[PDB]
Structure 1
Amino acid sequence: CDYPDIKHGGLYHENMRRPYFPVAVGKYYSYYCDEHFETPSGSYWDHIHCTQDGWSPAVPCLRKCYFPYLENGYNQNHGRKFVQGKSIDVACHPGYALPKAQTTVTCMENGWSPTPRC
């Protein structure tokens, strides 16, 4: 495996490790995830492994979306963390709604889609 291109993250001790690539199958390194992202284990860091099929995890950093405060909406989901791919229905106050007749928001690689607002 050559130097891992960790989209939305990176290796710890980058400077020390960079000169010694490529690495053999079975080698592994500690890595972190950037702001708005996390590892599949739900942490800010883990180890990335050089396997016969390349680097594992294949998607080392997943978007995490925090449900925002809704003015003119119900705030039962306020606080709550959602992982990339997860969706949630938006409950608005009477007389308010999500734009474009939308009913749910989804955590995409770039954040909430659409933006959760009533």
Structure 2
Amino acid sequence: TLKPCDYPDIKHGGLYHENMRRPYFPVAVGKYYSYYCDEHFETPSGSYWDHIHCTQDGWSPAVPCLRKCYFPYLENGYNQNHGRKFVQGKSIDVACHPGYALPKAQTTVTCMENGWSPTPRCI
């Protein structure tokens, strides 16, 4: 018998019912457990919780929790993207009012694991 999966270390999240489940690892292929993501991350299901599965090739999804960035209101810019949600890795062309721009000569902002880089502001 094989039990390849050990307690899943979930970045930006965790398992539900840790205390009850932790003593039963390692686990066999096919087992799964409900998990949550921290504030601002979501599961591939669009919820902030889902289930993670033990496979031959490890825990799946491989990346259980991804960052979601809210695009902020732009004081002196065009607000087509105000209130929009963007996923980690997403890049944006900030459209600034005439006479205004991103600081220090930037042109785009990216949703990073820790949030917008750099901060979308206009001036």
Shift of 1:25: 0.7
1:48-76 per-residue CA deviation (whole Å, 9 max, x = no partner) reads 00000110001100010000111111111
TM-score when scaled to structure 1?
Answer: 0.96
Which 5+ residue runs of structure 1 have no aligned equivalent?
A: none
How many residues are aligned here? 118
Over aligned residue pairs, what C-alpha RMSD do you find?
0.8
**Unmatched tracts of structure 2, length 5 or more:** none
Deviation at 1:45, TM superposition (A): 0.8
**How big is each residue's C-alpha offset from its partner over 1:34-57, in whole Å with a ceiling of 9 and x where there is no partner?**
011111222111110000011000
Give the TM-score taking structure 2 as reference length.
0.93
Q: Does 1:111 align with 2:109?
A: no
CA deviation digits over 1:61-102, x for unaligned, max 9?
A: 001000011111111101100000111111111100012222
Supply the distance in 2 between the matched residues of 1:88 and 1:69 (Cα, whole angstroms). 14
1:93 aligns with one of 89, 92, 97? 97
Deviation at 1:8, TM superposition (A): 0.3
Percent identity between the aligned chains? 100
2:20 aligned counterpart, secondary structure: helix
